[PDB]
């Protein structure tokens, strides 16, 4: 059940100063009178924190989650209840739910159909979701709980663990410092990108009391934590706030004497990631395989080995007339980047009803007697209509097939025997008599057939890898070279980082990359443009 709320007041989001809030005990270890430095996800000092207020103000929007969330609530009478998490916030994907009713705290991880306006309602009602089919994790614990109640929470999603911290403080955000303590860990193992909040409505038709909650975003950075002699964090320094705090974070102290100090270095970090490879040349000749004027018969299937070239499988994949593109044992998407030693193009023409027989583990006239595919076959098969080419009104007898053999053909074995098949007691002696016929019949196609019997030009690609160097590679995409900016370059396997600019250097024609006195790669030549 869902109840739509239309007493909202529209207002742009407010902002306020975070001051020095959002510091949590980074680990479980006791420490006293020690200035310790930690590197994790933290809320930056004096950052913008979104302000929400509810009173007729009703704020319950969808906020991104990013890397983390610092949640605060300067509260009285505890209107705020719980939270929602997920990526789509419906039963298309798994979702998380947390509630704090007047009796205990309930955590559920189930695939809910969340309402448009989830909320709660003493408390005598419940409207959050409509359905929940597959539920994975459940948990119950103790309840967590002039404005007087101040709550602070931190939510993180690292390696499937949902870390939660908490702190209560009796009392805009106050000007003070107080660390957050760990509360509960949950091995949800889900993906989270958005989150909500849960409110309990007061009815006296519904009236909302004065309440305000703030939402921040955690960022990866280093803090310097001071522990008092009782093991409680009393002060902190953001190592990346301003140059003064960087000096304290480097000197490992909180008071800096007069002088000049060297903290860190200046870094114009990169921007792009330019990968370059030589021009696309020496293409594998796949045109004569599919654009061939004539195709071999199914029994005498033509085998074409492909080597010493670059294979552009995207061209074949981009033709609509190739209706059936069935690939077994290898992903069609990764056919480009994957490299093979040799590719065998196996071309033939069959009827419409025997297309299914071109597959590992299949049986029939073609599978057993014409073309057999091994169970562990790596490659794709391509089929396209050929009524306009392989059919004659009088009949296209040019195609023949093999129907009889003492055993099923071995995989990738072609049989072209024309001796009169021998079956039993009386020898045939090459005579087309009783119980003795030719071992080959002829496909005779006409352009007057349906989809189930029209001649189809089917070519099977056999993918193999051998001890020899695999010289059949896919195309290697080259991003437009970026210049005058730090970028992560990868030129012909030469990997590194730096700003690529223009060069006045006169490389010799055979020289590719230049080195400095330091014996480090300082100059390099682009393969696309020399």
């Amino acid at each position: 059940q869902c109840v739509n709320l239309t007493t909202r007041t529209q207002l742009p989001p407010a902002y306020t100063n975070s001051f020095t809030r959002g510091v949590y005990y980074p680990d479980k270890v006791f420490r006293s009178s020690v200035l310790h430095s930690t590197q994790d996800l933290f809320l930056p000092f004096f950052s913008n924190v979104t302000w929400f207020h509810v009173i007729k103000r009703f704020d319950n929007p969808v906020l991104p989650f990013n890397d983390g969330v610092y949640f605060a609530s300067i509260e009285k009478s505890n209107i705020i209840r719980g939270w929602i998490f997920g990526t789509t916030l419906d039963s298309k994907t798994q979702s998380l739910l947390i509630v704090n009713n007047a009796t205990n705290v309930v955590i559920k991880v189930c695939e809910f159909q969340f309402c448009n306006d989830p909320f709660l309602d003493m408390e005598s009602e419940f409207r959050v979701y409509s359905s929940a089919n597959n539920c994975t994790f459940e948990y119950v614990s103790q309840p967590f709980l002039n404005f007087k109640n101040l709550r602070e929470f931190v939510f993180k999603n690292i390696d499937g663990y949902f870390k939660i911290y908490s702190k209560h403080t009796p009392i805009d955000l106050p000007q003070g410092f107080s660390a957050l303590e760990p509360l509960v860990d949950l091995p949800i193992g889900i993906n989270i990108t958005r989150f909500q909040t849960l409110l309990a409505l007061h009815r006296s038709g519904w009236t909302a009391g004065a309440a305000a909650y703030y939402v921040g975003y955690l960022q990866p950075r280093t803090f310097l934590l001071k522990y008092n002699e009782n093991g409680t964090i009393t002060d902190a320094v953001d190592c990346a706030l301003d140059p003064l705090s960087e000096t304290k974070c480097t000197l490992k102290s909180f008071t800096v004497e007069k002088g000049i100090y060297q903290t860190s270095n200046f870094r114009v970090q990169p921007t792009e990631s330019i990968v370059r490879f030589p021009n696309i040349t020496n293409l594998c000749p796949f045109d004569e395989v599919f654009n061939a004027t004539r195709f071999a018969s199914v029994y005498a299937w033509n085998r074409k080995r492909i080597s010493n070239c670059v294979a552009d499988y995207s061209v074949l994949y981009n033709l609509a007339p190739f209706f059936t593109f069935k690939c077994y044992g290898v992903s069609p998407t990764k056919l480009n980047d994957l490299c093979f030693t040799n590719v065998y193009a196996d071309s033939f023409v069959i009827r419409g009803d025997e297309v299914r027989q071109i597959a590992p583990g299949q049986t029939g006239n073609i599978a057993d007697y014409n073309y057999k595919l091994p169970d562990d076959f790596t490659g794709c098969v391509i089929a396209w209509n050929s009524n306009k080419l392989d059919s004659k009104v009088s009949g296209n007898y040019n195609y023949l097939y093999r129907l009889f053999r003492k055993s099923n053909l071995k995989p990738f074995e072609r049989d072209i025997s024309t001796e009169i098949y021998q079956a039993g007691n009386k020898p045939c002696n090459g005579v087309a008599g009783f119980n003795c016929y030719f071992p080959l019949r002829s496909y005779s196609f006409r352009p007057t057939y349906g989809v189930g019997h029209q001649p189809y030009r089917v070519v099977v690609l056999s993918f193999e890898l051998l001890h020899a160097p695999a010289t059949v590679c896919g195309p290697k995409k080259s991003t437009n070279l970026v210049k005058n900016k730090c970028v992560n370059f990868n030129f012909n396997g030469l990997k590194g980082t730096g700003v690529l600019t223009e060069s006045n250097k006169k490389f010799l024609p055979f020289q590719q990359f230049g080195r400095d006195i330091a014996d480090t790669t300082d100059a390099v030549r682009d393969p696309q443009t020399l």
């Binding site: 129907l403 039993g424 002829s442 005779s444 007057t448 057939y449 029209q454």
Partner: protein
């Protein structure tokens, strides 16, 4: 290395090499039938000579290994069909005469023209002109004159012809290790080597008699009502106790009683279920007529049509310049080609025939996975029956309302069901006494039980007892009345229609029970029933691989002939016959009291 493996290697090669030539034989026949021209005639002749010789050239190369050592039922069935001598068992001179005897009966019948004496300036052929006067004219003597004149001239020119036909046909059957040529036709239903489903050729005659003993009570009430109705049309020329005159059956042979609807209408004031006016009002062209069928055939579960069928099949008359054969025929060209040859009209009957011929086609690709030699119905009755059942559903008013042909506000009153049932009784119940008598007569003339000088007297006395029809005048042996029929004079099997009649209702009941129908059989339809198609599809896919008794048991649950579906279909009409037959006398007398 075994002899059975030899048979395994002999069929698939023979099947495909036939398919390449069977299509060319069929395509040239189709090419001849789509536009008749001299070259199309010789291409059929060249293909027909090639196709006939191809079977004969392998017939010589298929009969030198015994069949008792081959265990595969399909393989043994395939070789038995191919080993059948046919016309090859006689010598060349006898075979040359038998075919000419077969040929000379066809050309005499095809060119059979009867015209009035003293008026030889133009004469009238049987099929174009004599068929028109056969049911529309209401004159006793004029219709009698055509009935007498045709059989007098045709009988004289076929009685010596049939005398050589029967002796030569009987000789071939005896030369084929068969008791009679009637058993040769009975050999189509022969099943051997299968326990529980075994069938005997000689069992068919008593099975037909066993089935007919319940057909007669239904027929006698139908016969009495027709005689009572024709008593009004002909007051004194029909006796209340005797049989009907032979020239008042609506056809020359009395095969079909459908022409007597106007003569024997129960309620002429009420409108019929025909919705042909809606077809022309909404412009239902033959393309959408078959497309409406395609929607129906996929509703029950059968597959739809292919691109080849629509492009090549002609569903409309080509025109004056392009002459084509207009006979509705479904063409199984082979190699996955299935075409329907129909010069379709925008009428109720052609809409019903469209389902019948597509059902014939829908039968063809069901056994497309079967071997070519087995690419036929298990018996000659299934192929026609599977097409007849779907026309039964197409005639239901519920189907017409579903496809919009019939208005939803029309009321299916009791009379229109009585009138519709009577018409189906005329085409089905009426033909069975005629269907049985011809085959039973032919079964004995091949047996020799009937004396050679007593053919016609034996023919007449049973027709009085079986069909309840009396001859106008006694006919001596100089004439040959039976040979005037299309089937007998061209060596065509006639027991197929008797089995098709029984299979049609047996299949209809089985489909209706599968479809969970809450009403009678005549009101029943197979539309919107998924399970009906799959139950239907089981026998369609088997083809001739499995015995027809086995295929029957998969549908109706019984391997043998059953008549209960037939009487259930006409039960509302059967009771209606009994109510109004109190005044008339049920049955007939063998005497010549009427004429």
């Amino acid at each position: 290395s075994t002899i059975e493996e030899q048979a395994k290697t002999f069929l698939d090669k023979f099947n495909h090499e036939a398919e390449d030539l069977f299509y060319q034989s069929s395509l040239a026949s189709w090419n001849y039938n789509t536009n008749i021209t001299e070259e199309n005639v010789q291409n059929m002749n060249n293909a027909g000579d090639k196709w006939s010789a191809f079977l004969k050239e392998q017939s010589t190369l298929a009969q030198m290994y015994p069949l008792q050592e081959i265990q595969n039922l399909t393989v043994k069935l395939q070789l038995q069909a191919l080993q059948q001598n046919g016309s090859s068992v006689l010598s060349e001179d006898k075979s040359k005469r038998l075919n000419t005897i077969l040929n000379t009966m066809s050309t005499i019948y095809s060119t059979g023209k009867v015209c009035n004496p003293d008026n030889p300036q133009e004469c009238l052929l049987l099929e174009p002109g004599l068929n028109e006067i056969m049911a529309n004219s209401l004159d006793y003597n004029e219709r009698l004159w055509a009935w007498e004149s045709w059989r007098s001239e045709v009988g004289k020119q076929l009685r010596p012809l049939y005398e050589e036909y029967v002796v030569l046909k009987n000789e071939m059957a005896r030369a084929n290790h068969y008791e009679d040529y009637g058993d040769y036709w009975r050999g189509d239903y022969e099943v051997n080597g299968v326990d529980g489903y075994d069938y005997s050729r000689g069992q068919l005659i008593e099975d037909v008699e066993h089935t007919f003993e319940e057909i007669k009570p239904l027929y006698e009430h139908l016969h009495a009502y027709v005689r009572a109705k024709l008593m009004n049309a002909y007051p004194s020329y029909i006796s209340p106790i005797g049989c009907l005159p032979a020239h008042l059956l609506g056809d020359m042979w009395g095969r079909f009683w459908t022409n007597l609807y106007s003569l024997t209408v129960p309620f002429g004031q009420k409108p019929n279920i025909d919705v042909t006016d809606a077809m022309v009002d909404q412009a239902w062209d033959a393309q959408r007529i078959f497309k409406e069928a395609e929607k129906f055939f996929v509703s029950v579960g059968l597959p739809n049509m292919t691109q080849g069928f629509w492009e090549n099949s002609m569903l409309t008359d080509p025109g004056n310049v392009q002459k084509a054969v207009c006979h509705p025929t479904a063409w199984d060209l082979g190699k996955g080609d299935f075409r329907i040859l129909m010069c379709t009209k925008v009428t109720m009957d052609d809409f019903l025939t469209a389902h019948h011929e597509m059902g014939h086609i829908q039968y063809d690709m069901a056994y497309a996975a079967q071997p070519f030699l087995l690419r036929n119905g298990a018996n000659e009755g299934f192929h026609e029956a599977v097409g007849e059942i779907m026309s039964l559903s197409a005639a239901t008013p519920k189907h017409l309302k579903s496809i919009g042909l019939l208005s939803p506000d029309f009321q299916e009153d009791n009379e229109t069901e009585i009138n519709f049932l009577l018409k189906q009784a005329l085409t089905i119940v009426g033909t069975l006494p005629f269907t049985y008598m011809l085959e039973k007569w032919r079964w004995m003339v091949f047996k020799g039980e009937i004396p050679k000088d007593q053919w016609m007297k034996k023919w007449w006395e049973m027709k009085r007892e079986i069909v309840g029809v009396v001859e106008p005048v006694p006919h001596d042996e100089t004439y040959c009345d039976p040979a005037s029929l299309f089937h007998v004079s061209n060596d065509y099997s006639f027991i197929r229609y008797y089995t098709r009649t029984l299979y049609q209702f047996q299949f209809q009941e089985a489909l209706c029970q599968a479809a969970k129908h809450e009403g009678p059989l005549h009101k029943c339809d197979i539309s919107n029933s998924t399970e009906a198609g799959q139950k239907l599809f089981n026998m369609l896919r088997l083809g001739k691989s499995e015995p027809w008794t086995l295929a029957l048991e998969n549908v109706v649950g019984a391997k043998n002939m059953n008549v209960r579906p037939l009487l259930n279909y006409f039960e509302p009409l059967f009771t209606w016959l009994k109510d109004q037959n109190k005044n008339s006398f049920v049955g007939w007398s063998t005497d010549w009291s009427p004429y």
